[PDB]
Symmetry: D2
Subunit: 121 residues, 4 copies
């Protein structure tokens, strides 16, 4: 529906997702930055029964940076909300964790925020 | 990847995390929280590195849970991001972001941040 | 210098700061949202000797939401960087912690991001 | 506010946090980290609620440290945000954001996030 489609964030990354009736999110992610290449599988969940007011729809998805081409031994999870309308938007904040030794654990997680704009005409 | 990830885990709050790890990187299972606007199990989905590095690094992973089942809907979603550490006392160290569906006016206070540690030992 | 002055974020909040030679930041903050009113004291620290390349200047500051008018029993810390030039900017990500009982501790911290634009002509 | 905040604290990493709490809400002291690009003490400044609620809520506080002294400059700053809990075994539970000075091209990977727990007991 509103979430299903093709999106892009401020970095130029590509986000193609499909929203299922049971609240499931599946698709592929293509990052424009970092030790990444081509498409990576993504999986998430969303509130399939949001508030009818002016509230956004809570959702989230994960991407392990490993495919048949590269492995950055890391995973990112995006958490945010879908805001519908003429100009659909997905505002997120993310956590990127890397696999590290017990000694380097304190510096294993980066935090950021991505804003997605919908395309798919 | 000798993933001992599969199994039933518990966090410091007493929440029950049940997961199965697929050979290709998929994570699936149910989540039951001991705190907050929730009851019974909620479906969760995630991904993990099905080929961690040879050194002694943990296995990166993450998963999400929209807080809605047949009993309630807290109009929220939580994503956990972290790493699995195998061994005698296996553990999953994570940090999470909980986003609530809100109006544009309240978007600034829509996301909580925390951290949970899961072990295979009772709450 | 570059940091010293008056700033505003996307929410309409007011940030008046002075950068000291020893890396100290002092000033007042006025929030446009939340259980807040008037001016609150702020204190921070910044990298007083940044890289001469195109890097930003690392900095941070804290505000306890308590003054002679209100007390929201909370404190926010902003962490980010100052990016100079014609259009000065301060990109931050913040953590807002509230005082809570041990039972409600898991939901004591909100996270967000504020972008500041400089004014003081 | 019976602030037992003042004193020397240590975190799970072995870092030493020394602070003095002013009657009006100010926090000042030095910070020494056992990990990372750092050595010796670094000046820190912060604020805390000098009038917490009457119930059993913790005392909200926060502080910053730019990582530059006479020995090194890691071109970074860390802010800790959390709450003080008094009692037999006093503790300061916090979460932090570490921002590195970077170019616009690397801004997306400039901030690390974690959490530290400070107690008055040796490392
Ligand atoms: O490079 C890797 C994998 C690609 C990460 C892309 C990130 S996901 C959040 C943000 N949104 C995007 O669309 N793209 C970026 N990961 C990685 C990064 C840093 C470190 N590190 O140690 O700093 C280790 C692995
Ligand atoms: O209560 C709800 C749903 C359940 C959330 C459980 C959280 S998931 C992170 C942490 N780890 C656990 O095992 N359990 C907790 N969500 C919610 C919470 C707060 C707000 N709020 O506005 O503050 C809105 C919705
Ligand atoms: O309302 C209060 C105090 C004012 C907070 C202003 C925040 S600081 C980050 C952001 N940037 C701004 O310029 N303004 C906002 N705090 C508070 C908020 C929420 C809760 N809560 O429980 O949800 C408790 C206390
Ligand atoms: O090494 C530096 C300076 C020292 C940082 C100490 C951190 S403060 C949070 C945590 N709590 C502690 O007590 N100690 C650690 N900073 C730095 C670290 C990583 C990167 N990086 O790019 O990954 C850049 C600068």
């Amino acid at each position: 529906a509103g979430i299903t489609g093709t999106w892009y964030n401020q970095l130029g990354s590509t986000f193609i997702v499909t929203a299922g009736a049971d609240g499931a999110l599946t698709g592929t992610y293509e990052s424009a930055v970092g030790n990444a290449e081509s498409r990576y599988v993504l999986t998430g969940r969303y509130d399939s029964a949001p508030a009818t007011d002016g509230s956004g729809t809570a959702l989230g998805w994960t991407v392990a940076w490993k495919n048949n081409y590269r492995n950055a031994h890391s995973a990112t999870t995006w958490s945010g909300q879908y805001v519908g309308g003429a100009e659909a938007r997905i505002n997120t904040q993310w956590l990127l964790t890397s696999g590290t030794t017990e000694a380097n654990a304190w510096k294993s997680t980066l935090v950021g925020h991505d804003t997605f704009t919908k395309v798919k005409p």
